[PDB]
């Protein structure tokens, strides 16, 4: 489905490109809205921030695959480069539907200590995901234990 939709959006883009030059216009960023997140490569790559340098990036796929021989820790996404391909998936809807599957925020929080916190609303439930004692300690002189 990605390949068929890619053939479609890129043929439409090719047609709009020729008309854009016939009108001696530039294609507007939102003249391609709706197609932005489609195609292989993504249409959005046409407006990649560093495209003026990435135009020189050649052999990037084999380079990324050969990283396995020179680096101990490699990305499991060896096959795609977001600079050249764009974002090839979007899993944001999964979190929404898993919350619904679990019975909503209400049902989820019934399993937690939330009621005992006396916290006003579930909306203010901002977990401090960037600080804590263990974060202050990881830099210090510490034994393996």
């Amino acid at each position: 489905n990605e390949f068929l939709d890619s053939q479609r959006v890129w043929a439409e883009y090719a047609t709009k490109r020729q008309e854009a030059i016939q009108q001696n216009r530039r294609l507007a960023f939102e003249e391609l809205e709706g197609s932005w997140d489609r195609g292989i490569p993504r249409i959005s790559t046409l407006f990649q921030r560093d495209r003026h340098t990435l135009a020189y990036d050649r052999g990037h796929r084999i380079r990324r695959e050969f990283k396995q021989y020179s680096l101990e820790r490699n990305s499991p996404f060896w096959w795609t480069n977001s600079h050249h391909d764009g974002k090839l998936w979007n899993l944001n809807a999964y979190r929404t539907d898993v919350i619904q599957a679990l019975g909503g925020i209400e049902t989820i929080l019934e399993h937690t200590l939330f009621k005992g916190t006396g916290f006003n609303s579930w909306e203010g439930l901002f977990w401090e995901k960037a600080s804590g004692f263990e974060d202050s300690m990881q830099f210090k002189k510490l034994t393996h234990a």
Binding site: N92, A93, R95, T96, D97, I99, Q100, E123
Partner: peptide, 14 residues
């Protein structure tokens, strides 16, 4: 701020 996956509403509501 509330994350997008919370703010967005499943199609069946709207």
């Amino acid at each position: 701020h509330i994350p997008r996956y919370i703010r967005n509403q499943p199609w069946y509501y709207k």
